[PDB]
Amino acid sequence: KIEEGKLVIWINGDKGYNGLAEVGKKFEKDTGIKVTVEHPDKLEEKFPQVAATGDGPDIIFWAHDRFGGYAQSGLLAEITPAAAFQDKLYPFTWDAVRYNGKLIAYPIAVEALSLIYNKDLLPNPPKTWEEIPALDKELKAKGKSALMFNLQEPYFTWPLIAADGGYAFKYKYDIKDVGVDNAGAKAGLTFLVDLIKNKHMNADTDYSIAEAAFNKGETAMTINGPWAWSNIDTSAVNYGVTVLPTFKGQPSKPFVGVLSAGINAASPNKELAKEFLENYLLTDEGLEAVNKDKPLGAVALKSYEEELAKDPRIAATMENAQKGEIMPNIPQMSAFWYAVRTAVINAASGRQTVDAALAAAQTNAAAMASLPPPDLTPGAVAGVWNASLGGQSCKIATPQTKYGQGYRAGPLRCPGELANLASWAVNGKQLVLYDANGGTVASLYSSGQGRFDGQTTGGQAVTLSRLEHHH
């Protein structure tokens, strides 16, 4: 079990855990309660496994949207902070940590997309989406483009679609009220597609093409989150970050992710955990300790957010967050993503109309949400694989170690084209193996439990079979 009298905290490795440990020691000095801070591998999926068996950390830090499945799965303690304490965090951040009208976590930090522009190419960026066609003709005359952003993931195209009325589920979330083909969503997506029809954007621009274009000075604007600011400091491109453009006078509504701190329902230290988070972490000094270790971005605590907002990039993030739509914390969100990604791709590729793509998307999303359980997941690929080809055979490694928009991969005495394996990724139902130059080496599909079948980019058959042992 979880051990009484001590606090165990899990937080991801890309966070200021040493700063969090600092706050933990200040808490150990005033109370004698020891605070151990850990950053396990794949913590967001170890936690449900251990908490369901009465073990795990006392506190877990993760994005709010996963906590609704935890709370629906009764793996989280209900928190009841005083009204006086709730007033210190932005009111919308408490909405992100609400499930069935109960508070299930403490909001910590806040994240949302924002308009990123090149101040040299574009000193004063547009306030409206309507201005972007004219701005694009001006810039392409001079060999640049006005705007490029990932058109492949609904997360990036949703702020415009939802600007005039689109929404995932109505909000208590009603999984049978999907707002995907109302008038506002049709209008946003139609405007998006006509931008592509009128040759201001390319239907197949994805995350890397857009990021490369902006950092190489080829386009004046992009759309991304704080996670991408670091690669634009390598750029020496002088960029600003600002509010998203408005559509039909309505703000772009990006999805909002809220870093939150949940309490293990099996923890015998619930009250100790509430005191640490309320009285020690969620203070100007506590947040500063984590932030000096590793920046949080915008934060839910008003007082310290007023200090961080002196950075205009963080003020812009927070402003776009307060105008966006909180990412719904329900597992039925996976049906929203699947249906909407199909619809935006089909509408932008001309394979469907926005009225037909969105109509299908709302039918498929509503039906799948109402149903007990689509694409291939990087968890199902992570590991080491036997690789049969001809009479030849060998092994490849495909760790879930991020690398670009894919993952590191490695061949182990592999003949033929597999000797060039360097990265891997998943595309719906398809596993794709890549060069060190981004070229495609192979394409495979899950053909069963721990088994892949496909072919190289040059015709040779490939079969992947998992390595695994027994005690």
Author numbering: -314 to -144, -140 to 61, 65 to 162
Sentences from the paper on this structure:
U-Omp19 is a novel adjuvant that is in preclinical development with various vaccine candidates.
In this work, a structural, biochemical, and functional characterization of U-Omp19 is presented. Dynamic features of U-Omp19 in solution by NMR and the crystal structure of its C-terminal domain are described.
